[PDB]
Design an enzyme around this catalytic site. Structure first.
Site, short mmCIF file in Angstrom:
data_model
loop_
_atom_site.label_atom_id
_atom_site.label_comp_id
_atom_site.label_asym_id
_atom_site.label_seq_id
_atom_site.Cartn_x
_atom_site.Cartn_y
_atom_site.Cartn_z
N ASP B 13 0.96 -1.28 -0.07
CA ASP B 13 -0.02 -0.09 0.02
C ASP B 13 0.83 1.21 0.08
OD1 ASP B 13 0.62 -0.12 2.62
OD2 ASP B 13 -1.23 0.37 3.33
N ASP B 18 6.93 0.21 2.80
CA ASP B 18 6.16 -0.61 1.57
C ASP B 18 7.43 -0.68 0.41
OD1 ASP B 18 3.21 -1.42 1.90
OD2 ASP B 18 3.81 0.55 2.69
N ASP B 43 -2.64 3.05 2.67
CA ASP B 43 -1.50 3.95 3.25
C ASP B 43 -0.53 4.94 2.18
OD1 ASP B 43 -0.03 5.23 5.47
OD2 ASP B 43 1.42 3.47 5.29
N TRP B 86 -0.38 10.76 6.38
CA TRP B 86 0.62 9.62 5.92
C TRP B 86 0.54 9.20 4.75
CZ3 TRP B 86 -0.73 5.53 10.76
CH2 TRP B 86 -0.48 6.34 11.93
N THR B 140 2.23 -6.41 2.53
CA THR B 140 2.37 -5.14 3.43
C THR B 140 1.42 -4.04 3.59
OG1 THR B 140 3.62 -4.30 1.61
CG2 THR B 140 4.88 -5.62 2.94
N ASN B 189 -2.76 -2.01 9.51
CA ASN B 189 -3.25 -2.90 8.52
C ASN B 189 -4.29 -3.53 8.72
OD1 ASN B 189 -0.92 -1.88 7.06
ND2 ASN B 189 0.20 -3.82 7.04
N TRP B 263 8.35 -1.81 9.50
CA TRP B 263 7.80 -2.84 9.57
C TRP B 263 7.73 -3.67 8.28
CZ3 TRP B 263 5.49 2.52 9.77
CH2 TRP B 263 5.32 2.84 11.19
N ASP B 264 7.36 -3.13 7.22
CA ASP B 264 7.28 -4.01 5.84
C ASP B 264 8.59 -4.39 5.55
OD1 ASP B 264 4.64 -3.10 6.34
OD2 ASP B 264 4.39 -1.64 4.71
N1 LIG Z 1 3.05 6.23 10.86
C1 LIG Z 1 2.93 5.55 9.87
N2 LIG Z 1 3.44 6.15 8.62
C2 LIG Z 1 3.17 5.58 7.56
N3 LIG Z 1 2.73 4.35 7.31
C3 LIG Z 1 2.39 3.85 8.70
C4 LIG Z 1 1.81 2.31 8.79
C5 LIG Z 1 1.49 1.28 7.80
N4 LIG Z 1 0.84 0.32 8.51
C6 LIG Z 1 1.87 -0.97 8.93
C7 LIG Z 1 2.29 -0.72 10.39
O1 LIG Z 1 1.28 -0.63 11.31
C8 LIG Z 1 2.70 -0.89 7.81
O2 LIG Z 1 2.69 -1.55 6.64
C9 LIG Z 1 2.98 0.81 7.42
O3 LIG Z 1 3.34 1.15 6.17
C10 LIG Z 1 1.63 2.29 10.42
N5 LIG Z 1 2.03 3.42 10.66
C11 LIG Z 1 2.43 4.32 9.76
CA LIG Z 2 2.68 -0.74 4.27
#
Ligand SMILES: Nc1ncnc2c([C@@H]3N[C@H](CO)[C@@H](O)[C@H]3O)c[nH]c12
Ligand SMILES: [Ca+2]
Ligand SMILES: Nc1ncnc2c([C@@H]3N[C@H](CO)[C@@H](O)[C@H]3O)c[nH]c12
Ligand SMILES: [Ca+2]
Ligand code: NI
Ligand code: NI
Ligand code: NI
Ligand code: NI
Ligand code: NI
Ligand code: NI
Ligand code: NI
Lengths: 328, 328
Positions: B13, B18, B43, B86, B140, B189, B263-264
């Site tokens: 996403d 990602d 995202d 985000w 992801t 997610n 994370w991803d």
């Molecule tokens: N603060 C943040 N800024 C941008 N993106 C994210 C995410 C997205 N959600 C997943 C982790 O919970 C992961 O796949 C991230 O891409 C969580 N927190 C975020």
């Molecule tokens: Ca993601």
């Protein structure tokens, strides 16, 4: 009468557009001898802005042998603080790969403790007053440091200033300080310290050229222009400015047309190309009240305070920025 | 027993992690044959995510001759959308100079129309069903596309999946979904589309490996590490990943400890290096209610749903990321 560079000091507050301004000044040594920088804890966290100034200085020195210069953290304090979220951008830049080239980091760590010892307001006063020639001060943060200098030293300082080219204010257009406590008529650099801006802007003993929102609205930073830096990604300066601008192209969408502009950079561009804008003399009555209009720079209800920039050339700005970011 | 690359699809996403994920996968053709990418409007804004996927694919194809591959925009829509702020990350990336090299932009405009016709969900099903080998699907973003395929094709699809390696959930630790209506127990997610998540995570016919917050909390993106990319700024992939991370190192301060994590990227790292973490079998009761605990992935009061990653190696992750980003 053409081969001697202007002596310039950049008095900044460490956001992306401040550093694009820094890069435009420093990348053009034929036109500009940059003899020092001041960083203020306004639109950055000063330690981050300080480190980024030092590492840009060191990279340019490495690549095109521009001189090293003193850098000083101002101890000026806000009257009204910038939004915290905006102030983190100097930390992001500090971590960027283009500002962590190993030779640059090594040199900056050698030079940091000496610059650590400077007080930024005293450094601005010392650099101007010790300069052989008159100095152009380019102010892209608040006017707190200029005001401190004027208060402390009066004409012993101002007589050594050629002109002060300033990003700030909004004269015949709206402001950009949108808060529940404000009317939207004030611009941020002024709002940070209105009394400072009043002291400087209408000091009769300095030539102030003012890049107010009136002019800076002409140069929005947009994706279609930013993508241009890709064609010149082999140059470190294109990586830097390309990345700095790319970090901001969504703000117009996110804030519903309240764009990120190239405010500071256009201001610095005037030093490099005096014909990029025409000037208009204006008398200003800087609002230092603690009401909703705090920080406004309305025309005074009256001998001129400032030369307000008008009708800036988008095309010249474009050609300067792209040529400058091909320098190295 | 090691010389045959795995067949992988990245179902993502479009945020910074990602893409670091996409980069770790595509930079290691010996280990991974990336046969497709899906992008969901979660995202990111999908058009930006799409473009960035394409231009990364094109850049790696030019530099190390990794194959081109189909890319498709999912039409999945949010139950609960990501924070808008985000989501702009892929717009910033789309505008970066390292993602606007003329040759890559030209190749991607040549391939974009053909990819534009694809439906993301349909593409995911088609690629898995037509593969000669069983496909490891790296997820992801949200689980919406996996759930659509499982639902529409059953065993036809599921029998063609090696395993699904998924970034999502939080089992024995807190979540990261902090909103006026939630209790902080759920992870983003899953929260974006909880019913899709429930359908995949406890699907009896798919092996799921889950990188939940339990594991990902080990790999915060911190300035002291990110600054390492500077030593590698000559490689395009270090400019990408160093910038992607340096865009996020302030978030730990900004949100008072609620950090940006890799994370991803760690999720994809598992595909590259299965000894990077150990796995615990866990039955999960995915919460699809509309209250405080919407999207939570608690242990069930059952047969294993997923194999949860535990105690990931911080050092192995670092060595893989820095090795991969020197590939080109
Ligand atoms: N603060 C943040 N800024 C941008 N993106 C994210 C995410 C997205 N959600 C997943 C982790 O919970 C992961 O796949 C991230 O891409 C969580 N927190 C975020
Ligand atoms: Ca993601
Ligand atoms: N949205 C934003 N993000 C970051 N910085 C700024 C500013 C700063 N203040 C001046 C123009 O008002 C100029 O000096 C900018 O550096 C205004 N708006 C901003
Ligand atoms: Ca500024
Ligand atoms: Ni001359
Ligand atoms: Ni000194
Ligand atoms: Ni051009
Ligand atoms: Ni809006
Ligand atoms: Ni083998
Ligand atoms: Ni196709
Ligand atoms: Ni805080």
């Amino acid at each position: 009468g053409s081969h001697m560079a202007k002596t310039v000091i950049l008095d900044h507050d460490g956001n992306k557009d401040d550093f694009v301004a820094m890069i435009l000044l420093l990348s053009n040594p034929k036109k500009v001898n940059l003899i020092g920088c001041i960083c203020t804890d306004a639109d950055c966290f000063v330690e981050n802005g300080f480190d980024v100034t030092g590492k840009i200085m060191c990279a340019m020195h490495r690549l095109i042998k521009t001189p090293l210069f003193p850098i000083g953290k101002s101890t000026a304090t806000a009257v009204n603080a910038f939004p915290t979220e905006w102030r983190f951008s100097a930390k992001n830049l500090d971590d960027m790969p283009f500002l962590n080239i190993v030779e640059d980091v090594a040199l900056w760590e050698k030079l940091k403790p000496e610059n650590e010892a400077h007080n930024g307001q005293q450094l601005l006063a010392d650099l101007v007053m010790k300069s052989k020639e008159k100095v152009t001060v380019c102010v892209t943060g608040p006017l707190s440091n200029m005001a401190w200098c004027i208060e402390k030293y009066g004409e012993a300082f101002t007589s050594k200033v050629e002109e002060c080219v300033i990003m700030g204010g909004a004269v015949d257009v709206g402001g950009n300080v949108f808060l529940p406590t404000t009317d939207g008529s004030a611009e941020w650099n002024i709002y940070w310290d209105p009394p400072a801006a009043k002291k400087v802007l209408c000091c009769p003993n300095i030539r102030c050229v003012l890049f107010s929102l009136d002019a800076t609205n002409t140069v929005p930073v947009r994706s279609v222009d930013v993508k241009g830096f890709g064609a010149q990604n082999q140059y470190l300066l294109s990586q830097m400015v390309g990345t700095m601008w790319a970090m901001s192209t969504h703000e117009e969408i996110l804030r519903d047309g309240d764009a990120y502009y190239a405010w500071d950079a256009l201001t610095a561009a005037y030093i490099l190309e005096p014909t990029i804008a025409t000037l208009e003399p204006v008398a200003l009555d800087v609002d230092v009240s603690k009401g909703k209009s705090e920080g406004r720079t309305p025309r005074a209800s009256g001998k001129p305070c400032v030369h307000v920039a008008r009708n800036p050339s988008k095309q010249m700005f474009h050609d300067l920025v792209f040529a400058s970011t091909r320098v190295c």
